[PDB]
């Protein structure tokens, strides 16, 4: 599969192939780096209104290399979100909980930013008013797969200084067979 390269929201992205198909020691060492980043993921759960309390039932910044934006994107708190995003250190990943972080999410009104997609890049989205903790966990597995298939610069001195994000197959196309092949459901008149 093919990747997008980001190199030094308004920047340009181009869709190229991975540089590992062009050395054999670099291939396994990059695999070990991606494995280490995938297995040990430290989250920074941002404290917002009513998705943050939902994932409570499921640390300080700059040691957590991952931000989970939970609640509604208020215009007063959006600079706080971006500032806390630039606090964290590369590599960093973003998981959006709820419709309010993906989009405006039932609030298309003056005081709500239409998602954090307007100002920070998001790696994984989760749809819907408050998602279950199992949905957050499955998003963690999906992002672990995305991190495990990546090509980041191993050092800032020697090597290609560009980040390669993989074009994953979308979950609606992958799970299309098991979703369309659903015949019957339980009636809502029982428990």
């Amino acid at each position: 599969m093919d990747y997008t390269l980001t190199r030094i929201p308004l920047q340009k992205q181009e869709i190229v192939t991975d540089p590992l198909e062009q050395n054999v020691f670099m291939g396994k060492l990059n695999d070990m780096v991606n494995w280490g980043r995938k297995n040990s993921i430290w989250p920074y759960n941002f404290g917002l209104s009513c998705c943050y309390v939902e994932m409570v039932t499921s640390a300080s910044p700059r040691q957590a290399d991952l931000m989970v934006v939970a609640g509604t994107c208020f215009t007063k708190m959006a600079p706080v979100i971006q500032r806390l995003y630039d606090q964290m250190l590369e590599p960093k990943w973003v998981i959006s909980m709820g419709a309010c972080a993906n989009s405006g999410g039932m609030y298309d009104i003056y005081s709500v930013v239409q998602g954090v997609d307007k100002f920070i890049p998001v790696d994984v989205y989760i749809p819907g008013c408050p998602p279950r903790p199992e949905a957050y966990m499955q998003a963690l597995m999906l992002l672990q797969e995305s991190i495990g298939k990546e090509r980041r610069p191993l050092s800032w001195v020697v090597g290609d200084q560009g980040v390669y994000r993989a074009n994953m197959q979308s979950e609606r196309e992958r799970k299309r067979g098991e979703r369309i092949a659903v015949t019957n459901l339980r009636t809502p008149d029982e428990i």
């Binding site: 250190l89 590369e90 050092s155 001195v157």
Partner: protein, 106 residues
């Protein structure tokens, strides 16, 4: 000494242990820095009080450090002088308790 061919081995092991622990920490910090890729007021006086308690009782402790090695070479007169040393030490300690310097009370 540098001639007993076993304690000199222990000295070499001790020095190499120190320098290779320092080198391991330095190389760990070097690996952290190199690899990864880039992108008025005043505290109190109670802290001073407890640190002064630490240093004063630490010197009054180093006296017992020296005493504890020669505790059997010295006789009962050494026990008597160490007993009155510990007695005046505990008198100062209970003075600090009863006055109130030793409590925090937030």
């Amino acid at each position: 000494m540098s001639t007993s061919t076993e304690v000199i081995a222990h000295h070499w092991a001790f020095a190499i242990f120190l320098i290779v622990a320092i080198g391991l920490c330095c190389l760990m910090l070097v690996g952290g820095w190199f690899l990864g890729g880039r992108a008025r007021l005043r505290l109190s006086a109670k802290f001073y009080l407890v640190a002064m308690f630490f240093v004063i009782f630490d010197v009054e402790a180093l006296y017992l450090f020296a005493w504890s090695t020669s505790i059997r070479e010295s006789g009962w007169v050494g026990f008597v002088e160490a007993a009155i040393f510990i007695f005046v030490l505990l008198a100062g300690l209970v003075y600090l308790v009863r006055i109130g310097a030793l409590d925090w009370t937030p």
